[PDB]
UniProtKB/Swiss-Prot annotation, chain B:
Description of the deletion phenotype: Eliminates avoidance of elevated temperatures along a thermal gradient.
Intramembrane segments: 28-48
Functional note: Essential for thermotaxis by sensing environmental temperature. Receptor-activated non-selective cation channel involved in detection of sensations such as temperature. Involved in heat nociception by being activated by warm temperature of about 24-29 degrees Celsius.
Annotated protein name in UniProt: Transient receptor potential cation channel subfamily A member 1
Full-sequence portion shown in this chain: 942 to 1026 of 1197
Family membership noted in the UniProt record: Belongs to the transient receptor (TC 1.A.4) family.
Localization per record: Cell membrane
Topology, Extracellular side: 13-27, 49-63
Subunit structure: Homotetramer.
Domain of life of the native organism: Eukaryota
Membrane-spanning parts: 64-84
Amino acid sequence: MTPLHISSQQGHTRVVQLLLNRGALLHRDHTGRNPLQLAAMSGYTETIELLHSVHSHLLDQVDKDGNTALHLATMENKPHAISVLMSMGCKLVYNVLDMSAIDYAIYYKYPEAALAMVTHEERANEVMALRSDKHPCVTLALIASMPKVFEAVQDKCITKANCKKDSKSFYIKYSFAFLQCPFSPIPLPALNTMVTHGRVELLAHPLSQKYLQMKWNSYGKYFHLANLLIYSIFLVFVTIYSSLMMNNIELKEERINRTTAILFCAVVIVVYILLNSMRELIQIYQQKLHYILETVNLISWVLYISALVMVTPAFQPDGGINTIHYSAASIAVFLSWFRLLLFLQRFDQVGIYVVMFLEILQTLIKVLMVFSILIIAFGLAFYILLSKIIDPQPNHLSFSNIPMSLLRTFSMMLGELDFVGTYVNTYYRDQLKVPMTSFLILSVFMILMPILLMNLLIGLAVGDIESVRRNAQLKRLAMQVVLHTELERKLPHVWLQRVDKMELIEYPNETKCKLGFCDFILRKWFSNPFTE
Amino acid sequence: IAFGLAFYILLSKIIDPQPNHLSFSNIPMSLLRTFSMMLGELDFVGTYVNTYYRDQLKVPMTSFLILSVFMILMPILLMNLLIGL
Amino acid sequence: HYILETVNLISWVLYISALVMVTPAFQPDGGINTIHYSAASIAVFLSWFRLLLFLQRFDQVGIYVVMFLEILQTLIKVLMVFSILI
């Protein structure tokens, strides 16, 4: 370092003014830095503006590592010396590690030095179009790392006008240019990342709401209603067909009489399954590895096979009914209605109660596999003690088998111990095989299975209802994102990208059109974005 | 309605209707009886075990399947939703 | 600590009961009676209740056995005080 490097590093402005007027020449130090790199490493924005006015060429030359003056002021978090180096016209070039200026501010996690770059007035949308190697999109990297910064980028996408807030020419402009980032066009890129990391403050912001209300009014309100009314034809023609089969079930082998009402219902079922399987086979062609992962598709294959096995005796020459047709009927009627609860998650007033039901069902599968130990622990222990009763009365027959003693143990943590019938009556007439231990395993049963385990499952289903009423706003907004995602995953691209807009101009003083009665019904019982 | 129809399919055509299977011989009666056995009285020994070891239960291995998924979610999972609310 | 620690005292009721269970496989004739059904059921029940003490240390499902063995410590202090009412 020369004394021009040392004086400008410490920011002594009157000394660097003195050395310039007496002809202090300029050259690099051993690192490669000029006097303006060093004054920018420290935060002295009075010495940057002096040196740039005298020697204007040394703003945008690099050291031996390829860093400019903007990288160096970003590597150690001087946000006042970034807003000055960008206003003078720094060049925004890449490092020798191929890592830009905004990269070091989202990699060292400096939220102050990355807010001074993406909120700059002149040069905002030249640092949000860099597309580096470690970060391919700056929008999708601020939502992951620093979500307070991206809330201050959405504030600058809402521009007003200056017309006194109540005149007839006051428009408010929304700009969706950053929520749709071209780098496989996944449908809502910047909102599937808000819900993956769970950012509720970036979904409830008034730019994201108008981005969904642009899509709700466009296409996404008619194609949820037209998915429920197609399923409610398969729902009705299954419960009608199983109800008719139970009356028309006469003898002679057992054989049904194929009337013109169970033959009409068996055709509407078998034609619904083919047309709703050739929608499945299209979705198999692109989306192979989520059929292990997603459950609601796997439910629809047990439903569709069972409804095909149900309708087979309406097509044979004689109606061949047997045990395997009652089995497939009851699985088809039960799964047709349990599928209907998956469509009622998205209603308005009553939708939250199926979110609470399917979250305390996810916990009770992890609990009822861990504490399937205790059912095997007792169910074997009652099979040892209670199976060799010398006269099996039809209350001890439920323990004469190893799988039957595991059902019976599970259906007496629900209340019916039958204490008088199979422990007291069979003891005072000298029939209980091992007396003083049968009252020991039972006395430790009713301490911990119907008291201690059933109060564990109540205490877990109060903490999974409170943690839905807590974050209910995230649960509602994540339904509408995942709705519009898969809806335009299926629509054709030719009249998809011509109906969205890049910017919405709104006039909040003109006489609005009154709401149509068809549109008024669609807003009462659907989770719409119009409830702000 | 999902279970009450499903028990009407499996349990209505028992070849000797004992007065514990008469509550499932009708579609509105199988919707009362399903609602009054999420309150505790499954009657597991009376209408599933006694009528199985004397060869009277019509479809055996599925009647223990709908019942085993009944007592997971109606008298455990639904009745602990109404306590947590 | 054998007075103080419980999981060692469980392992001695388990090991004695499994020895009494296997005695009629070693006698000249198999002498089975009531005391061999008693030791069999305590050995099968305590073999699996010991298995819940190893699942405390798993990742996703381990917290649910911590909750089970903490509401079991309270329900012993309560079901000795309110053994008066019984």
